[PDB]
């Protein structure tokens, strides 16, 4: 019953400061746009032991599968390959990402009916909002 409240299928409804996260993180002009456009679906579901991410877009659909704070390889939307390790910290799934040095951090939180989605590289925070699809 490890993460019940997430499993579903999700639509994202806004965005806020998703472009300057993008430009931190290192995502090129033309991905930035095409990808800002996105309307993704996100799909959570559980089996035994471990946790699948899917996303849907018209931009790129990915999938990660994984066992809390069990490390493992992601090639993200934008194309990095980055080495990502998922832990609930408090009720919040803490994802984060490390690929040349770098480091971000995504948090996933229930708030309501909604599943907010915070992104985090340096200082820059970007914000995404699903509801339930
Ligand atoms: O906020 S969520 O889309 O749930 C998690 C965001 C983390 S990072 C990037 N996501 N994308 C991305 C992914 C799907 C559709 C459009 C953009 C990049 S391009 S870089």
Redesign the pocket.
Known sequence: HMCDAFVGTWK?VS?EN?DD??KE?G?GFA??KV??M?K?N?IISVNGDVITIK?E?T??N?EISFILGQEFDEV???DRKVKSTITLDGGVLVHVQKWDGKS?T?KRKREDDKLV?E?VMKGVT?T?V?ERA
């Open positions: 994202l965005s998703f996260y993008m993180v995502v991905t930035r990808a800002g996105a993704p996100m996303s877009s931009f790129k990915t993200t939307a934008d971000t995504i989605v992104c970007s995404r699903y």
